[PDB]
Amino acid sequence: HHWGYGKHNGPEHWHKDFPIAKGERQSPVDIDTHTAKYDPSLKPLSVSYDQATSLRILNNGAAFNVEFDDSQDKAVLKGGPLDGTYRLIQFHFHWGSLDGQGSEHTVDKKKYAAELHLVHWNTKYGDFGKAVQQPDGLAVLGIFLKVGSAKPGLQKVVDVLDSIKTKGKSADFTNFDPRGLLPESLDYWTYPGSLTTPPLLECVTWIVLKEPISVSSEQVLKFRKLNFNGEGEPEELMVDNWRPAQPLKNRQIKASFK
Ligand SMILES: [Hg+2]
Ligand SMILES: [Zn+2]
């Protein structure tokens, strides 16, 4: 009886196995744009993904992850509210059963159809495992998805989902360029938070982009065909794999723009 997104093992139940769920810096949160503080000292984000090397795509029962080779500084994030270099290890999405919900973070209570999370770890800690033991060990770049025009750069991902329909399945996924998933502007909001799935560790510096990317109804529909279940068990569609907004507590959201 492990964690999930169902009525008996959903987000409201996570605190029993992961007490940190009721912690001081949990994510996601609602971004109140009028209370966010413009910080002139925040430097522009530096995204260097030209040398990225994707390796595999897999269904882990909660979402699907596209993993990258992080043995060298091939795809890194620098600048912004960050000190040092952060290496990209994987990206995944959270989505809903309908176009009106799916994102984890909200903007003035508005929910988007999905949210993309590019996960990076601080290279000064040597590896991901060590990074998750530090308060500044991870940096997650969050991008909202709205339904409208199709995103060409996302198609290669949607076309392989059929091969990893059930939990545990994985497939080679090389030469995928994540630059095709980025919006025009890099304006962002940032705040200290946590991973949005167990273990819910509080080691994340969140960088949420203000500009969402558009994807087509057909593309998001393919996400909804995945299964939470594995093997040959009762089919349970992988939808609404998002966590509700958490208390901001003693935290301030900063904006790179005004
Ligand atoms: Hg941590
Ligand atoms: Zn996530």
Domain total of the chain: 1
Q: Which domain holds residue 127?
A: 1-258
Resolution, rounded to a tenth of an Å?
1.6
Nearest ligand, measured from the Cα of 23: 1
Separation of CA 128 and ligand 1 centre (Å)? 11
Which ligand is in closest contact with the Cα of 119?
A: 2
Judged by its nearest atom, the ligand closest to the C-alpha of residue 92 is 2
The ligand with the least distance to the CA atom of 199 is 1
Indicate which technique resolved this structure.
X-ray
Nearest-angstrom CA–CA distance, 236 and 198: 20
CATH number for the domain spanning 237: value is 3.10.200.10
**C-alpha of residue 12 to centroid of ligand 1, in Å:** 22
- Comparing CA positions, the residue from 182, 179, 193, 183 lying closest to residue 254 is 193
Burial per residue of 106-117, b for 16 or more beta-carbon CB atoms within 10 angstroms, e otherwise: bbeeebbbbbbb
| Structure tokens given for 238 | 């992988």
Rg of the chain, C-alpha, whole Å: 17
- Please compute, for residue 90, the number of CA atoms within 13 A of its CA located in the half-sphere on the CB side: 15
